[PDB]
């Protein structure tokens, strides 16, 4: 599970029906500053995340251990909306 800042949305119309209604989001890993520095990865929402929010997306075989993401084919999903990120006792990120 990696920090990430939402960047955009992906829209697919021809997809496996088990997943329809899933919200596809585009996240780039961010340094603990909110400044996105990484490659684009897609993930489904399960928390009601929007663009511009800093999130945690879990990946792989354990990205399905959440309802409306069960035996569905998904290998990356959001699971949290950060509120502050501490580093050594000095806050580096806020809402």
């Amino acid at each position: 599970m990696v920090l990430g800042k939402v960047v955009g949305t992906v829209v697919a119309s021809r997809k496996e029906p088990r997943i329809e209604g899933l919200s596809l989001l585009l996240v780039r890993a961010c340094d603990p500053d909110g400044t996105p520095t990484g490659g684009a990865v897609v993930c489904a929402d399960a928390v009601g995340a929007g663009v511009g929010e800093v999130v945690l997306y879990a990946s792989g075989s354990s990205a399905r251990q959440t309802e409306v993401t069960n035996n569905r084919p998904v290998d990356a999903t959001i699971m949290a909306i950060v509120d502050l990120v501490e580093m050594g006792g000095d806050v580096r990120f806020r809402k």
Binding site: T9, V11, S13, E20, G21, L24, D45, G48, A49, G50
Partner: protein
């Protein structure tokens, strides 16, 4: 003409949570909401079809977790006379 997406919810929060998740899922313009009284409220979104179709399908899933959800429907090509006679935004 821009597509049409609608969600009609008994509560009010149902519309909002539906309205948001509809916006967060694709490039859509939330164009307003229409209160028919008696508690029934309807959110109206418009945009490209494939975007609405994802937002709509997403909005249903987001509002049901609050409950209610009366109706969910999508109009791809509203007749010109609709957009002229009804408050769906794209009205001249």
């Amino acid at each position: 003409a821009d597509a049409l997406g609608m969600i009609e919810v008994r509560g009010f929060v149902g519309m909002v949570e539906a309205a948001d998740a509809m916006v967060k899922a694709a490039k859509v313009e939330l164009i307003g909401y229409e209160k028919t009284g008696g508690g029934y409220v309807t959110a109206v979104v418009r945009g490209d079809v494939a975007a609405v179709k994802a937002a709509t399908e997403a909005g249903q899933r987001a509002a049901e977790r609050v409950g209610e959800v009366v109706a969910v429907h999508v109009i791809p090509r509203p007749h010109v006379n609709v957009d002229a006679a009804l408050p769906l935004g794209r009205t001249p």
